[PDB]
């Protein structure tokens, strides 16, 4: 009878970039989903496939918690069937996705005077990503018909670009921490019940 640790995902001192979002496993827990949904401290809380309204009586094999940080206008992009730079090059969700998406403001923690440029996103890629695909390549992007020879000159760009977060920006340009909960149900252990 041990409760799930969500102080390691939500109460995390450091979050990950959108192109390098972090993932952790939760198992053998008494996780209750009513506490988070009834905390009155989260801006966005949307669940697809399952309903959060007192459905904390389900068992699953495993729980995947995926955390990262984006800007406000991109928070709507973390959803099935969404399009954009983040949705196509950084983070992707399956069309038949079942799970929950939680998002809360982080201006008071992830914004700095003069610009905090520690968060990066991929701007160019040869093709879109697959669901749950994580790319950390640094190969330069050839926008022309000539080889770039590994240098960033004309029609040769660095595919990764850094966000600029300042406390005086609007809510659409402020940082926002996003956590996606995904549930796995295999044909044996079902160790994540949380009565």
């Amino acid at each position: 009878t041990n409760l799930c640790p969500f102080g390691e995902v939500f109460n995390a001192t450091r979050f990950a970039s959108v192109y390098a979002w972090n993932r952790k496993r939760i198992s053998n827990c008494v996780a209750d989903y009513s506490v988070l949904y009834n905390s009155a401290s989260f801006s966005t809380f949307k669940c697809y496939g399952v309903s959060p309204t007192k459905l904390n009586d389900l068992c699953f094999t495993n729980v995947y918690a995926d955390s990262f940080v984006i800007r406000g206008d991109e928070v709507r992009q973390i959803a099935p069937g969404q399009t954009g730079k983040i949705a196509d090059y950084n983070y992707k969700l399956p069309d038949d996705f079942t799970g929950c998406v939680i998002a809360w403001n982080s201006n008071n923690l992830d914004s700095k005077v003069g610009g905090n440029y520690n968060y990066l996103y991929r701007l160019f890629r040869k093709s879109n990503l697959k669901p749950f695909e994580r790319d950390i390549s640094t190969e330069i992007y050839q926008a022309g018909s000539t080889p770039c020879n590994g240098v960033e000159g004309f029609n040769c760009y660095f595919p990764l670009q850094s966000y600029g977060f300042q406390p005086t920006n609007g809510v659409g340009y402020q940082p926002y921490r996003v956590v996606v909960l995904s549930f796995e149900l295999l044909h044996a252990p079902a160790t994540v019940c949380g009565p």
Partner: antibody
Amino acid sequence: QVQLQESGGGVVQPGRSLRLSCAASGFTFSRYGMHWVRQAPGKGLEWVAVIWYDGSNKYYADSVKGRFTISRDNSKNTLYLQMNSLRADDTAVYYCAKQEGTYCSGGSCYSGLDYWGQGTLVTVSS
Amino acid sequence: DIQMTQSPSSLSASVGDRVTITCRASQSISSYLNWYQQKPGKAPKLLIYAASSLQSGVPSRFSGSGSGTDFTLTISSLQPEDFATYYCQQSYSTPLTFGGGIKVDIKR
């Protein structure tokens, strides 16, 4: 009760072809990537080929490139391998492997192999 | 390609000791490493994935650590059923490569 069963092993003469199958039960086959592993008698494990969850990209080892073809039939819940121009270095036990995690499972649709079959013995001799 | 090296190729230990196994690589693979067991005449099955994450059902004494090019695995307790051969696999890019293999035997 997650299970994988392989079939198709036997004895074949060099220069011929063979076709191996593995059937799975206990999970949704259409959302996972699949791998082939082979172990020669008395030596270690060797990775052969990989196919993704939707079959878009298929990849092979250098020692079997141009001769081996991997495929998946998730409408019948099975995975197939075709071996051509077989030689004496292809005698081994074959395992059909299911990786941990759904879709790309955290990176480039490659992850650790969570479930394994019992394997089939394939012998090439004259 | 990426070559994965395991030295030594054999190991001898007695019940109650501490066992450490090391896997090495030739390029940077970040944390895409997996550890497998195998008893003779049986399927391998998985012990640790992501180079630091345990599996469901395995006894809670195996611990994996490391990132970059060198990784290590620790047993911390030997049991009669903890005698097998261990392998490390990289899952960064194709072709995926296994290791040579290390075998744990009985000291005498």
